[PDB]
């Protein structure tokens, strides 16, 4: 006859298939806690040590599975702690439900303890942002929040006065709309548009296909188009792994979390096929300033001709359109453009291999990542924090379609490594999970290493300890007139942090220590989380956006300095390969 | 002839006497970093490990000194990390300037990396909230922000596109208005109002003076009025210390961070003088429902008759008005009301002493606080986190006018213990500083123990490890139908956390360990920070808002249970003393 | 080599096919005005007399053509005057671009004249809401705003510091992405789901098809499905006209802007096919409380299961789905349900005809609408204000697929009659255009009758002068305990208002005066606007939501009073027809 409104809210979550949710309790959210407590069998509550980790792990759930992530915070400071996770979900356009505690309706607007108007707090981050005021409609408001988060690929926020979830409502009135949920059946792209686009791509002398994560289902088509047509591939950093890194004509990504061949080739390309791509550096870096024809495939009308004046923009699914292109083309013989790029890639990979293959001496990030590679399972998931690690992981990890990797792509909040890995292990208990974090980002969320312990989540945490905000030190070196400030700091020993949260850990500072430590960690992570604190050097990684290798573009002094600093003596500029196969710039 | 707009901004900060500021650098704020770097001698930059600690320490600066606190965060996630500190400053009504990084004006609104419209983020927390768009007026905007933060006692926020602080502006144009800054000369309260108010207070049979921190300058007048007129004193929790805790007619505070005599007496009072007080539980707890006459002294017109229907509300300075009352009254003989309260206080203090004076056995919070008392200097400053520690510190610390104590009073964000203590030691290098934190709150900001080490801030950190959100577990016990959830969790060993950040530390779990550990910590904190991790029991502290001691109000079974749980066998209800001196309820 | 940024911005509007735009100039928007002035041969500026009319007309443009509407207002009060039209655009989900004046960047944040942080003002209404800060990127920010407004079907607001449009930018860098524009892809109906839906619909004893404007392309299919399957049709009020009103099994709309047969049939229906419909009354009115099965077709996943739990939900285009149902069914025999409804419709229309067909006496709204019908061209466009006119026009206008009618559907802002008619005449100079408005709503925007005169826009304005807010008077009658207040007021002679703005006009107060006045108006509007001020009675129109005709449900006294008041002696309840064909109510 009656049901507690709170019990009904949990039944809405269960109807939408929410497996786990994150938060920290408080008096202002104890009636939702009370309903969760009764439903421990069907929905798994994960108590975090800081609510931002809950919000970031919710976003990561959605990044990994496509299913809505769920978090909560108590009134006032519980909810405002969510913000870095919620902005991450907004900017990374993944569905997240955030519940916010509120004082009961009898005390709202009385200026009582921790009581404020919480609605304006969430207005900017949230696609849907409402304070519930009635128990009977509360299940519907939760259902509405979820349906909107999914439909609009963003954050829904609901402030809940704590009295409402303890009120009885009729048992037969509330429902969830999870049963109506479906994915659309999209039309095929028009043959005429696809044909026009194909002719332009094929007529190019120096073509590139430049994809982002909108092409995540088109890995097969991308690689086969490349091989058949002899057109090199480049991607956004997040799109790494869609085509295996092994692929000899994968150039990497452009800009700064970037690889030399992609930046060089992009500068030379006459035609770019830009697919499922919203590259944020397009305009500011003038990436397409020498491009003759810009062709686009995107599913979102908001993106059409967004990043560059577009000759042909096809509104369509990436995979369907790329498959449709593939169906109308056939073999082209190897071209000088193709051979020049292959040779350029080869030269670049040998450079990266020479960094990895050092056997003895002062530990660098490069050998640490090689050691990750050596213990990694073919379907490992990598949760990656924010800083030099993005650049290093982008160059060194050897990813294929079986892997996943996530970071905070656009909002780029430090601290995501720990919660991303928590979410990954909760969704995929049988898959190996890494957290690769710099010392700055790891220190921001370090308390939640305890959450991995408490819930027995066998994450392999690898902390890169340079005692710097390395990413920012290098920026200051490029722009700042005065001395470094705020970017070099005191050591934290993360093996001791790990010990404090009752997690097994190692600290290493020499290349020769890696094989045995990483072997131990692999084994430990069969049952329990582990941490490796890698004390690395302060060497600046090669800046792919500031290459000094080409005699025609840089002074001989500039080149010798760059080669020295970046151990880059055997790197050749793309122009060398262009000339080799009989082409100019 | 010219000056960098950034250099001028720092000169504005220096003109307003800003000694130190907190933040973490990023590319979007590196031009402000560049100006700070050149001015290291005259303004001290404190690099924190999480920007919320910077914001909380800025609020604490203002809490302690009355001078504007200053913090910053880089664009996107740097600034959103500030939020718990900024809401704390808003709710605690202290002046704070927050600078937010932004992408340069040429890339704003281009949807580039970490670039968004940041202005709506800060609209709710901030009294003044603006995006700067011109270098020439930037010093003025900073000056305007400061002047407004001070005038309105809140948060000013300025988003700064990173190009502006590197632009040249005329050297002679910009100025600071720090030279115009003054405190008002207030009138005296009218004699007639003071007289009317005094007659009503004196005619009462059961008077109380109930002050908050608006009476911080009136400690002397408060205690002398009490002694002369025989009127007991009670305060808000934050107003503890304004009159020495030793004072025999100080009752303590009401509600939950509360002491038994204050709650009991308040329930009996016929007349309350409510001074410099904005007690947020007034209405929700029906604190004044049996009060006959409610008299008020406040400096803010917004507060007049806010918390209860007010018979006489004098708009005036607390000290001036209390001194004016004192000047028109003289000695009254001891009354039964006075003696009953004194006896009630005595009984309560013996109870607290019996908890503190245990010498051997399972460690409780009570003996930990006695150990703090034993090593505390008479002018020590206490930065207090949020949870059971507020209740325990309120009962046990032996404070006088020479002390300071701060917490997050109204927003009540956990994690403030560490940053409050950092700010306290930076403002008062020669004064002993404690951070008293529960394990939940300490774990939220633990990474910034490293900041105390880096800057050689000899804080005494005392962590109360119950492996619970104790405050919330007890709430769940009171309200929740189903089992405890989210409030009991795994151990973190903070002596090992401290070791990881290179801070000397101890862990204790037995009463008999306290004297030697606290003696060592006292000595260590002559030169370096120290941490004591006190593993305490899960005993619930006596709930002053749920007393079961009075035969006329509770069942004999209820009383025996309460006496047993709370080691309260020798506590008597106020009514016993009322009857003793010949009064009824 | 260079172009003024303001010139480039107008070229972006031209590239996007903007024909006309509305607003009022000011110092803060004079550089956009300057650019507009040079471009007066290619884009047409419409000067309004109040900025809300500009914003409202921009919304109506989009409602009519699907082309983004464009309006502007100067800094401060110019922009805030836009709100009612911008909220109208958000709630009716149509693309509008709003440009807001702002002081130059050298004066922003100086607290100068009409200068303020304008961004927070538009945060709630806008899908995209930015302050421009750079001249070179300004064309892109405008291009971005338009593309988002279109993609997201809502409002984009750009605040423009007045200096930027007067700055020179490189002539060759800016572009518009209008060439790349596409409308979102239409999802396809699953064949098996459509088959399941059809079987449930065909098994129904009492089926209804209940469509909204999502089905505006499916009129042919709606009507043919109805005839073939013997299933009555009902619609939301805005969907009136998608199926010709003369169609015998069109019941009308439900709730209050409603027709008796729709409300009665919906109460009895066992199965509802709810298609392209977001009826906001569904839950609050319990429309579907006794519906056994609910079948939904909608393009938007956010709507699926929103208004009732679905038994079958199809995420697909309305016309494709309905075509697919029709393609798999054949002629059904008549059923008792079908006959009962057809007879109820005939009885209802005879009632409305009886009101329209009065030939002399005190003028009522019904005869005015009949006189509109008599002069209306088959493809007339109706801009309808808000109040009793929505209910009356819903019952009396005889519309077909050749007509258009618009109002403020959901925000339901009064005053839209005038601007909507202005926009209608601008987009369709060869079609007859009516503005049908109550005296309350016409009053709000009356000054912009001068805009119809100024631009020679031959609108037929008809004002229904009851000297009341009748819609609200009736609500007060229904709910209020004390006397009417604020709902009856002094006369305004709109024929004199019209005379004042130099528009030909008539005032009538008798039924017999209509034929000749309407003939004259019809003729005048071949070349110039005209106004008819119809002084009507204070008769309440029949409340379709409060029927008192069924003796099984209402007393004799209530039935008699209802018939007498609403001249409804000859109306029968649906149960009469249900019983005739052997079905119990
Ligand atoms: C420290 C740091 C530095 C960074 N710097 C770089 C850098 O130097 N280089 C770099 O490349 N990245 C960098 N990034 C990542 C970067 O900010 C952007 O997030 C990224 O480049 C955008 O990738 P995307 O276009 O794949 O993803 P998104 O921005 O998510 O875009 C996906 C696109 O695909 C479309 N789409 C989605 N589904 C489909 C479909 N089915 N069919 C067709 N289209 C579809 C979407 O509409 C959208 O346009 C960095 C990240 C960090 C943390
Ligand atoms: C976990 C937790 C629990 C808490 N629960 C309790 C509790 O149970 N009991 C309790 O007492 N507190 C409690 N609080 C603290 C509480 O929330 C309020 O912050 C506090 O009671 C308000 O104290 P106040 O009135 O002294 O300060 P404020 O709210 O800052 O008010 C100061 C008042 O003095 C006025 N004023 C300022 N200057 C002058 C002047 N010169 N002359 C005259 N008037 C002036 C101001 O206008 C204002 O009205 C708790 C805090 C925490 C962290
Ligand atoms: C004074 C006043 C009183 C009113 N009261 C009433 C009233 O009593 N009764 C009444 O009916 N109305 C009333 N309204 C109008 C009412 O508020 C709503 O706007 C209306 O009922 C909703 O109509 P709709 O569903 O047709 O439009 P919308 O709310 O615009 O919904 C259209 C739906 O169609 C979907 N859609 C769009 N395109 C497609 C496609 N190609 N295929 C499939 N689906 C598609 C959309 O996703 C959306 O769900 C009143 C208006 C006024 C001004
Ligand atoms: C991208 C960005 O804005 C970066 S990268 C970075 C340095 C990360 O240091 P870490 O030690 O973790 O990595 P390292 O480079 O290997 O030393 C900072 C401070 N920021 C700015 C910043 C500031 N604060 C927060 C919460 N997030 C970000 N992204
Ligand atoms: C007051 C309030 O809302 C409290 S007190 C408290 C427990 C503190 O636990 P700790 O271990 O630090 O202390 P203990 O009681 O001694 O065990 C919580 C979670 N909350 C809610 C809450 C949640 N999250 C944050 C950031 N701040 C608050 N205040
Ligand atoms: C629906 C709604 O919210 C209505 S309908 C109505 C009365 C309309 O009076 P009018 O004389 O124009 O029409 P009449 O009924 O024919 O007398 C009002 C005041 N309101 C509230 C209201 C107030 N103000 C504005 C701008 N818009 C609305 N919708
Ligand atoms: Mg680092
Ligand atoms: Mg605790
Ligand atoms: Mg009217
Ligand atoms: Na932290
Ligand atoms: Na007006």
Short mmCIF file of C-alpha atoms in Angstrom, two decimals, chain A residues 364-544:
data_model
loop_
_atom_site.label_atom_id
_atom_site.label_comp_id
_atom_site.label_asym_id
_atom_site.label_seq_id
_atom_site.Cartn_x
_atom_site.Cartn_y
_atom_site.Cartn_z
CA UNK A 364 63.53 8.09 -16.29
CA UNK A 365 59.80 7.98 -17.04
CA UNK A 366 60.59 6.15 -20.32
CA UNK A 367 61.87 2.93 -18.70
CA UNK A 368 59.07 3.02 -16.16
CA UNK A 369 56.57 2.90 -19.03
CA UNK A 370 58.52 0.09 -20.74
CA UNK A 371 58.25 -1.82 -17.39
CA UNK A 372 54.45 -1.23 -17.42
CA UNK A 373 54.39 -2.60 -20.99
CA UNK A 374 56.26 -5.72 -19.91
CA UNK A 375 53.71 -6.69 -17.24
CA UNK A 376 50.58 -5.47 -18.99
CA UNK A 377 47.83 -7.92 -20.02
CA UNK A 378 46.50 -7.48 -23.62
CA UNK A 379 43.16 -6.18 -22.32
CA UNK A 380 44.49 -3.93 -19.48
CA UNK A 381 42.72 -0.68 -18.67
CA UNK A 382 44.72 2.43 -17.88
CA UNK A 383 43.42 5.24 -15.74
CA UNK A 384 45.77 8.13 -16.42
CA UNK A 385 46.20 11.31 -14.38
CA UNK A 386 47.06 14.79 -15.82
CA UNK A 387 50.57 16.14 -16.60
CA UNK A 388 53.74 14.72 -18.26
CA UNK A 389 52.18 11.23 -17.83
CA UNK A 390 49.70 11.98 -20.67
CA UNK A 391 52.60 12.77 -23.01
CA UNK A 392 54.72 9.81 -21.83
CA UNK A 393 51.86 7.27 -21.80
CA UNK A 394 50.77 8.51 -25.26
CA UNK A 395 54.24 7.78 -26.68
CA UNK A 396 55.15 4.61 -24.77
CA UNK A 397 52.05 2.52 -24.04
CA UNK A 398 51.53 -0.19 -26.65
CA UNK A 399 47.78 -0.25 -26.96
CA UNK A 400 45.44 -2.21 -29.19
CA UNK A 401 41.62 -2.33 -29.64
CA UNK A 402 41.45 -4.71 -26.55
CA UNK A 403 42.67 -1.97 -24.19
CA UNK A 404 40.92 0.98 -22.62
CA UNK A 405 42.52 4.24 -21.42
CA UNK A 406 40.80 7.19 -19.76
CA UNK A 407 41.82 10.54 -18.38
CA UNK A 408 40.18 13.94 -17.84
CA UNK A 409 40.38 14.82 -21.59
CA UNK A 410 39.29 18.49 -21.74
CA UNK A 411 38.69 19.82 -18.21
CA UNK A 412 42.00 18.01 -17.44
CA UNK A 413 41.61 17.91 -13.65
CA UNK A 414 44.60 16.41 -11.86
CA UNK A 415 43.77 13.64 -9.40
CA UNK A 416 41.66 11.44 -11.75
CA UNK A 417 44.17 8.56 -11.82
CA UNK A 418 43.08 6.98 -8.48
CA UNK A 419 39.22 7.25 -8.99
CA UNK A 420 39.39 6.23 -12.65
CA UNK A 421 41.17 3.01 -11.60
CA UNK A 422 38.69 2.41 -8.77
CA UNK A 423 35.79 2.68 -11.27
CA UNK A 424 37.62 0.48 -13.81
CA UNK A 425 38.20 -2.34 -11.30
CA UNK A 426 34.59 -2.11 -10.06
CA UNK A 427 33.26 -2.47 -13.62
CA UNK A 428 35.84 -5.04 -14.70
CA UNK A 429 36.90 -7.17 -11.69
CA UNK A 430 38.70 -9.67 -14.04
CA UNK A 431 40.72 -7.12 -16.05
CA UNK A 432 44.11 -5.75 -15.06
CA UNK A 433 43.86 -2.05 -14.09
CA UNK A 434 46.68 0.53 -13.88
CA UNK A 435 46.64 3.98 -12.36
CA UNK A 436 49.48 6.00 -13.95
CA UNK A 437 49.86 9.29 -12.09
CA UNK A 438 52.40 12.07 -11.56
CA UNK A 439 53.29 12.91 -7.95
CA UNK A 440 51.32 16.17 -8.03
CA UNK A 441 48.08 14.49 -9.22
CA UNK A 442 48.48 11.42 -7.03
CA UNK A 443 48.98 13.62 -3.97
CA UNK A 444 45.63 15.41 -4.65
CA UNK A 445 43.60 12.20 -4.28
CA UNK A 446 46.10 10.05 -2.28
CA UNK A 447 43.66 9.46 0.63
CA UNK A 448 41.55 7.32 -1.71
CA UNK A 449 44.27 4.72 -2.06
CA UNK A 450 42.55 3.60 1.16
CA UNK A 451 39.33 3.03 -0.87
CA UNK A 452 41.17 0.53 -3.13
CA UNK A 453 42.29 -1.32 0.06
CA UNK A 454 38.86 -1.21 1.74
CA UNK A 455 37.07 -2.63 -1.29
CA UNK A 456 39.90 -4.99 -2.32
CA UNK A 457 40.36 -3.41 -5.78
CA UNK A 458 43.71 -4.81 -7.10
CA UNK A 459 44.84 -1.68 -8.96
CA UNK A 460 48.50 -1.31 -9.97
CA UNK A 461 49.31 2.28 -8.96
CA UNK A 462 52.44 3.74 -10.56
CA UNK A 463 53.42 7.19 -9.27
CA UNK A 464 55.99 9.19 -11.24
CA UNK A 465 57.89 11.16 -8.59
CA UNK A 466 59.90 14.00 -10.16
CA UNK A 467 59.23 16.39 -7.20
CA UNK A 468 57.83 18.85 -9.77
CA UNK A 469 54.71 19.96 -11.55
CA UNK A 470 56.73 18.91 -14.59
CA UNK A 471 54.07 19.92 -17.16
CA UNK A 472 53.97 23.45 -15.74
CA UNK A 473 57.74 23.85 -15.10
CA UNK A 474 58.28 23.30 -18.84
CA UNK A 475 55.60 25.88 -19.67
CA UNK A 476 57.31 28.40 -17.35
CA UNK A 477 60.63 27.64 -19.10
CA UNK A 478 58.93 28.52 -22.44
CA UNK A 479 57.01 31.65 -21.40
CA UNK A 480 58.24 33.11 -18.09
CA UNK A 481 60.86 35.88 -17.76
CA UNK A 482 61.61 35.30 -14.04
CA UNK A 483 62.69 32.16 -12.09
CA UNK A 484 60.66 28.98 -11.76
CA UNK A 485 57.94 29.35 -9.12
CA UNK A 486 55.56 26.82 -7.53
CA UNK A 487 56.71 23.93 -9.78
CA UNK A 488 59.52 22.32 -7.75
CA UNK A 489 58.65 21.00 -4.34
CA UNK A 490 59.49 18.58 -1.52
CA UNK A 491 59.48 14.78 -1.88
CA UNK A 492 56.55 12.66 -0.78
CA UNK A 493 57.39 8.97 -0.39
CA UNK A 494 54.31 7.21 -1.79
CA UNK A 495 55.50 3.74 -0.69
CA UNK A 496 55.15 5.17 2.87
CA UNK A 497 51.75 6.73 1.99
CA UNK A 498 50.67 3.28 0.69
CA UNK A 499 51.92 1.60 3.89
CA UNK A 500 49.84 4.15 5.90
CA UNK A 501 46.68 3.01 4.09
CA UNK A 502 47.75 -0.72 4.42
CA UNK A 503 48.65 -1.19 0.78
CA UNK A 504 51.75 -3.09 -0.37
CA UNK A 505 54.27 -0.82 -2.06
CA UNK A 506 57.73 -0.32 -3.54
CA UNK A 507 59.92 2.66 -4.18
CA UNK A 508 62.50 2.61 -7.00
CA UNK A 509 65.10 5.09 -8.31
CA UNK A 510 67.33 3.03 -10.68
CA UNK A 511 66.52 1.43 -14.07
CA UNK A 512 67.96 -1.91 -12.94
CA UNK A 513 65.39 -2.16 -10.11
CA UNK A 514 62.38 -2.23 -12.46
CA UNK A 515 62.10 -5.87 -13.64
CA UNK A 516 61.84 -7.46 -10.18
CA UNK A 517 59.62 -4.76 -8.61
CA UNK A 518 57.16 -4.85 -11.55
CA UNK A 519 57.12 -8.68 -11.44
CA UNK A 520 56.23 -8.56 -7.73
CA UNK A 521 53.53 -5.96 -8.38
CA UNK A 522 51.99 -8.03 -11.21
CA UNK A 523 51.67 -10.97 -8.78
CA UNK A 524 50.38 -8.92 -5.83
CA UNK A 525 47.70 -7.38 -8.06
CA UNK A 526 46.28 -10.85 -8.63
CA UNK A 527 44.47 -10.26 -5.24
CA UNK A 528 45.24 -6.84 -3.73
CA UNK A 529 46.15 -3.26 -4.80
CA UNK A 530 49.85 -2.36 -5.06
CA UNK A 531 51.82 0.84 -5.48
CA UNK A 532 55.17 1.55 -7.16
CA UNK A 533 56.69 4.97 -6.44
CA UNK A 534 59.13 5.62 -9.30
CA UNK A 535 61.64 8.39 -8.42
CA UNK A 536 62.36 9.75 -11.90
CA UNK A 537 64.73 12.43 -13.27
CA UNK A 538 63.79 15.99 -14.13
CA UNK A 539 64.59 15.55 -17.86
CA UNK A 540 62.20 17.43 -20.14
CA UNK A 541 60.56 15.01 -22.64
CA UNK A 542 61.07 15.92 -26.31
CA UNK A 543 58.65 18.74 -27.24
CA UNK A 544 56.94 17.55 -30.45
#
